[PDB]
């Protein structure tokens, strides 16, 4: 019976909530109460990357922490040398409505996607000297929001059809379709070991998926609105979610519940991007108020503020060595902060 | 200089890339962008045919003006997560079928099709991203509407309607109902044109509307707002 099934589901939810409450002997606030505050963080704009003529929607650092890719609505994917402000490549996309970009860990490939529901993967190292589209992965029935490279052959995408997918590029097929979200999935983050990945969707839920097996292991709730940004903790045992409720949240995988909410009364605008430094101490979140706020991860106190973007900060990334922080906003500029 | 030979050559390559980007940006700015929306079967495909997966792209050229029509009817996702990508388009072509005053939606009979069109129009016209963005309102299927009003009256769609059941007066009433959904009648302006299957002046109407929009935009840009 449908009523019996709903009652069983409600009972299981009650049991899960009871277990989570039982495991909550203390909180991250009191445990880190005696830790020294980080202090006033002031980051200066070392570089400003000019050349984009439309709103920047995506950005991804390379592994070497020098080359970064940027996607904006003018239909171009620009690869920048951050050390000396230069344009290595300018790939003209077929669809100008790009909402995500990815840099492969090796550096041989760059993926883009958007309202075409197609993950287009381009080859940077080619004997012809020009960037050529290696593959056009299709099969998603909704807009692509984020794509992350596992390696040079597998890519993980999230779409607006409430699904995520794992593609092998050499056949362009969906190896594993991750389903279970009710709303559109807007962000995904790969764990450092690249065995689990967390996807945040518009039903205010973040789900943790096993890549090899293919089912959702844990579901984290608590947000009052859509999750637009997700980012794994460097340890891989936590992650951070940004939402339109003007709050960030830190979820622990092993504790299977939230640990802290970063919020302030002066902030009403939603979070577009969320990233960590290479220590897990600083949570950098891009906000719609043309600002990028740096929180202390262990103490909810606001460590610092980055201003200098004239429009909404859409994308935000941190290099693998943690040297610099790239921020790209809707004012068609990328700023490298240090 | 403190620059190597290959560093200098890389700088030259970056300068060439910058020049190409500027050229393509000028070409793109010379274009006109239209976002084409419609309440499902609203005659949108018919007009798409007469001017010439996810987002459908259409390019045509009329009187030395290069248009770019974007159709997002196949997205079937949360519109609020990608409607901001079209902020700054030159115009929004909204297609409404006048034959839907009788037909009710397949999903439940309590909620009417022209009411769906009106709700979509309210969402798009009053959207925070489209405040100064003009709307070109196409009212399609006028022949079927004119034929059908004789049998069933307009009172079903509008109970408060009190007027003659002639084609002209009912069409004017529907147009007025659609233009009173515009909360801001000063920042934005609504162009209404009636079309059918055999109409051949729709592209001309769109051209006139976009020319007027361009005139307004460059009046704002020239300091004569």
């Amino acid at each position, epitope marked *: 019976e449908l009523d019996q099934l709903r009652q069983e589901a409600e009972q299981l939810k009650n049991q899960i909530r009871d277990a989570r409450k039982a495991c909550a002997d203390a909180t991250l606030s009191q445990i880190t109460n005696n830790i020294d505050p980080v202090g006033r963080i002031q980051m200066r704009t070392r570089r400003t990357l000019r050349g984009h003529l439309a709103k920047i929607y995506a950005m991804h650092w390379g592994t070497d922490s*020098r*080359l970064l890719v940027s996607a904006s609505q003018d239909g171009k994917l620009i690869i920048w*040398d951050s050390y000396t402000t*230069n344009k*290595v*490549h300018a790939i003209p996309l077929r669809s100008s409505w790009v909402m995500t970009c990815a840099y492969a860990p090796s*550096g041989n490939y760059v993926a883009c996607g958007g309202l075409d529901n197609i993950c287009s993967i381009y080859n940077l*190292k080619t*004997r*012809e*000297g*020009n960037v050529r589209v290696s593959r056009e992965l299709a099969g998603h029935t909704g807009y692509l929001s984020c794509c992350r490279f596992l390696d040079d052959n597998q890519i993980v995408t999230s779409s607006g059809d409430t699904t995520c997918a794992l593609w092998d590029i050499e056949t362009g097929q969906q190896t594993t379709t991750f389903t279970g979200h009710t709303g559109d999935v807007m962000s995904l983050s790969l764990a450092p070991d690249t065995r689990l990945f967390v996807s945040g969707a518009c039903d205010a839920s973040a789900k943790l998926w096993d890549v090899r097996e293919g089912m959702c292991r844990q579901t984290f709730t608590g947000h009052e609105s859509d999750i637009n940004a997700i980012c794994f903790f460097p340890n891989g045992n936590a992650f951070a979610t940004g939402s339109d409720d003007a709050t960030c949240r830190l979820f622990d995988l092993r504790a299977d519940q939230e640990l802290m909410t970063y919020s302030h009364d002066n902030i009403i605008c939603g979070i577009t991007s969320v990233s960590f430094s290479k220590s897990g101490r600083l949570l950098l979140a891009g906000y719609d108020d043309f600002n990028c706020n740096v929180w202390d991860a262990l103490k909810a106190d606001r460590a610092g503020v980055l201003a200098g973007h004239d429009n909404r900060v859409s994308c935000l990334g941190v290099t693998d060595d943690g040297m610099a922080v790239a921020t790209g906003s809707w004012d068609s500029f990328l700023k490298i902060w240090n | 200089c*403190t620059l*190597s*030979a*290959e*560093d200098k*050559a*890389a700088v*030259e*390559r970056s*300068k*060439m890339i910058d020049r190409n980007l500027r050229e393509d940006g000028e070409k793109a700015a010379r274009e006109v962008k239209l976002l084409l929306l419609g309440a499902g079967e609203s005659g949108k495909n018919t007009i798409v045919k007469q001017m010439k997966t996810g987002i459908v792209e259409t390019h045509f050229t009329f009187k030395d003006l290069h248009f770019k029509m974007f159709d997002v009817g196949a997205q079937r996702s949360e519109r609020k997560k990608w409607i901001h990508c079209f902020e700054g388009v030159t115009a929004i072509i909204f297609c409404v079928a006048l034959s839907d005053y009788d037909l009710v939606l397949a999903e439940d009979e309590e909620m009417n099709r022209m009411h769906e069109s009106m709700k979509l129009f309210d969402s798009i016209c009053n959207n925070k991203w489209f405040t100064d963005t003009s709307i070109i309102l196409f009212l399609n299927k006028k022949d079927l509407f004119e034929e059908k009003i004789k049998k069933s009256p307009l009172t079903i769609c509008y109970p408060e309607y009190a007027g003659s059941n002639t084609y002209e007066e009912a069409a004017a009433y529907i147009q007025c109902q659609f233009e009173d959904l515009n909360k801001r009648k000063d920042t934005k302006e609504i162009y209404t044109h009636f079309t059918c299957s055999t109409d051949t002046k729709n592209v001309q109407f769109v051209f006139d509307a976009v020319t007027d929009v361009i005139i307004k935009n460059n009046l704002k840009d020239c300091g004569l707002f």
Partner: single-chain antibody
Amino acid sequence: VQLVESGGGLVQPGGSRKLSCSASGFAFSSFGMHWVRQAPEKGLEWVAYISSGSGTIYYADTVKGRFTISRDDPKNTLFLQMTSLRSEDTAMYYCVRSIYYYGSSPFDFWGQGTTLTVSSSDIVMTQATSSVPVTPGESVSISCRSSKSLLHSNGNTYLYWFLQRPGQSPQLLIYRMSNLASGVPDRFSGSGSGTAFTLTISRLEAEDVGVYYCMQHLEYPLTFGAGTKLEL
């Protein structure tokens, strides 16, 4: 990728010729181009260079004024118009492509060249080895010394190793003194200390026999070494 070149022949001194380099299989416009001479029994010497989009043109000191190098991007071709020819220009000319960005590999593909005969402050790169014996399966080291430090302040040492097989166009091996080119087996390695550099082959076969050259790329008189020949 092909870089076939045309022209050459026997020219009386004081004349003029046009050397043509036809390119197919790659983007011409994004690639800078170089001309490199080869005397009948001697090493390689850089002649002329044009950047992408014909922005910058460089010539060697010994060929300044007389030669003029140009490109036709729509036709995908390279021209070298040569005037006031003397017996010092009798060489096997080589058309070389070179792209320049971060992490790029300049001097990838060398054309087959054209034979041309005439009727009768730069960095010094020296390889004193000249000729060293080789046995298959062994490991060999080839040394190249520089007049000034090839290490630029940015951290990129600018040294290129080329292998010219008997009766073959030169082939890039190492770019920037430690980076292996595409299609080159991993047995090749490069090391250096700013001025003196070595290139090591772990296990050679008959395919590795040839003459090895070292090029600098710091300033732009591009100078090669004397070369070191391997004989089994």
